[PDB]
Ligand binder design. Structure first.
Ligand SMILES: CCOP(=O)(O)OC[C@H](O)CO
Lengths: 49, 65
Protein backbone atom coordinates (compact mmCIF):
# COMPACT_ATOMS: atom_id res chain seq x y z
CA UNK A 1 0.00 0.00 0.00
CA UNK A 2 2.87 2.38 0.78
CA UNK A 3 4.63 1.60 -2.51
CA UNK A 4 1.36 2.11 -4.42
CA UNK A 5 0.91 5.68 -3.12
CA UNK A 6 3.90 6.97 -5.12
CA UNK A 7 1.93 8.61 -7.99
CA UNK A 8 -0.98 9.47 -5.68
CA UNK A 9 1.18 11.01 -2.95
CA UNK A 10 2.98 13.21 -5.47
CA UNK A 11 -0.31 14.77 -6.61
CA UNK A 12 -1.30 15.83 -3.08
CA UNK A 13 2.01 17.69 -2.67
CA UNK A 14 1.83 19.37 -6.09
CA UNK A 15 -1.60 20.91 -5.54
CA UNK A 16 -0.32 22.86 -2.51
CA UNK A 17 2.76 24.50 -4.04
CA UNK A 18 2.29 27.94 -5.65
CA UNK A 19 1.89 27.69 -9.42
CA UNK A 20 2.62 30.61 -11.72
CA UNK A 21 -0.02 32.10 -13.98
CA UNK A 22 -0.18 33.98 -17.29
CA UNK A 23 -2.33 37.04 -17.91
CA UNK A 24 -4.42 37.72 -21.01
CA UNK A 25 -6.29 41.04 -21.19
CA UNK A 26 -7.42 42.91 -18.09
CA UNK A 27 -10.03 45.65 -17.75
CA UNK A 28 -9.45 48.91 -15.86
CA UNK A 29 -12.74 50.64 -15.09
CA UNK A 30 -12.71 54.44 -14.79
CA UNK A 31 -15.87 55.81 -13.15
CA UNK A 32 -15.95 59.33 -11.69
CA UNK A 33 -18.78 60.74 -9.57
CA UNK A 34 -19.12 64.25 -8.20
CA UNK A 35 -20.73 67.65 -8.46
CA UNK A 36 -19.56 71.22 -9.09
CA UNK A 37 -21.15 74.14 -7.22
CA UNK A 38 -20.29 77.53 -8.69
CA UNK A 39 -20.00 83.22 -6.70
CA UNK A 40 -21.05 84.92 -10.74
CA UNK A 41 -18.81 88.29 -10.04
CA UNK A 42 -20.78 91.31 -8.38
CA UNK A 43 -20.94 94.35 -10.80
CA UNK A 44 -20.65 98.05 -9.63
CA UNK A 45 -22.57 100.09 -6.98
CA UNK A 46 -25.89 98.18 -6.42
CA UNK A 47 -27.20 96.92 -2.98
CA UNK A 48 -29.24 93.88 -1.68
CA UNK A 49 -27.75 90.28 -1.76
CA UNK B 1 -20.44 92.11 -15.93
CA UNK B 2 -18.66 95.45 -16.31
CA UNK B 3 -16.97 96.99 -19.36
CA UNK B 4 -13.40 97.41 -20.59
CA UNK B 5 -13.87 100.75 -22.39
CA UNK B 6 -13.79 102.74 -19.13
CA UNK B 7 -13.23 102.14 -15.42
CA UNK B 8 -10.27 104.52 -15.03
CA UNK B 9 -11.85 108.01 -14.75
CA UNK B 10 -9.15 109.44 -17.02
CA UNK B 11 -11.08 111.25 -19.76
CA UNK B 12 -13.53 112.65 -17.20
CA UNK B 13 -10.80 114.46 -15.24
CA UNK B 14 -9.18 115.73 -18.47
CA UNK B 15 -12.16 116.89 -20.58
CA UNK B 16 -14.54 118.35 -18.02
CA UNK B 17 -15.56 121.44 -16.10
CA UNK B 18 -13.02 121.13 -13.26
CA UNK B 19 -10.11 120.54 -15.64
CA UNK B 20 -7.98 122.53 -18.11
CA UNK B 21 -10.38 122.65 -21.08
CA UNK B 22 -12.34 125.58 -19.62
CA UNK B 23 -9.14 127.67 -19.49
CA UNK B 24 -7.99 127.11 -23.09
CA UNK B 25 -11.43 128.11 -24.45
CA UNK B 26 -11.76 131.40 -22.52
CA UNK B 27 -8.55 133.02 -23.82
CA UNK B 28 -9.16 132.20 -27.50
CA UNK B 29 -11.94 134.81 -27.75
CA UNK B 30 -9.87 137.72 -26.43
CA UNK B 31 -6.95 136.64 -28.63
CA UNK B 32 -8.87 137.42 -31.83
CA UNK B 33 -11.99 139.34 -30.74
CA UNK B 34 -10.10 142.10 -28.93
CA UNK B 35 -7.66 142.67 -31.83
CA UNK B 36 -10.10 142.86 -34.77
CA UNK B 37 -10.65 146.60 -34.16
CA UNK B 38 -8.05 147.37 -36.85
CA UNK B 39 -9.97 146.62 -40.06
CA UNK B 40 -13.55 146.34 -38.76
CA UNK B 41 -13.77 148.54 -35.63
CA UNK B 42 -17.45 147.84 -34.98
CA UNK B 43 -19.51 146.50 -32.08
CA UNK B 44 -20.20 143.00 -33.40
CA UNK B 45 -18.14 140.34 -31.61
CA UNK B 46 -19.76 140.92 -28.22
CA UNK B 47 -22.25 138.02 -28.08
CA UNK B 48 -19.64 135.53 -26.84
CA UNK B 49 -19.13 136.86 -23.29
CA UNK B 50 -21.94 134.69 -21.88
CA UNK B 51 -22.21 131.64 -24.15
CA UNK B 52 -18.98 130.14 -22.78
CA UNK B 53 -20.44 128.98 -19.46
CA UNK B 54 -23.67 127.91 -21.18
CA UNK B 55 -22.13 125.65 -23.84
CA UNK B 56 -19.99 123.88 -21.23
CA UNK B 57 -23.04 123.17 -19.05
CA UNK B 58 -25.35 121.80 -21.78
CA UNK B 59 -22.77 119.20 -22.85
CA UNK B 60 -21.06 117.99 -19.69
CA UNK B 61 -24.26 117.41 -17.69
CA UNK B 62 -25.76 115.19 -20.41
CA UNK B 63 -24.60 111.78 -19.17
CA UNK B 64 -22.65 112.43 -15.98
CA UNK B 65 -21.26 108.90 -15.55
C1 LIG C 1 -25.29 145.14 -33.57
C2 LIG C 1 -24.51 143.98 -32.94
O1 LIG C 1 -23.58 143.53 -33.85
P1 LIG C 1 -24.07 142.51 -35.09
O2 LIG C 1 -25.37 141.93 -34.67
O3 LIG C 1 -22.88 141.72 -35.52
O4 LIG C 1 -24.43 143.62 -36.32
C3 LIG C 1 -24.79 143.11 -37.55
C4 LIG C 1 -24.26 144.08 -38.64
O5 LIG C 1 -22.96 143.76 -39.02
C5 LIG C 1 -24.33 145.53 -38.12
O6 LIG C 1 -23.34 146.25 -38.79
Amino acid sequence: VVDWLLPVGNMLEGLTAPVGCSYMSGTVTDVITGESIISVDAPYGWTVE
Amino acid sequence: QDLMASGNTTVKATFGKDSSVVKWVVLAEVLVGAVMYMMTKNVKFLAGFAIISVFIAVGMAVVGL
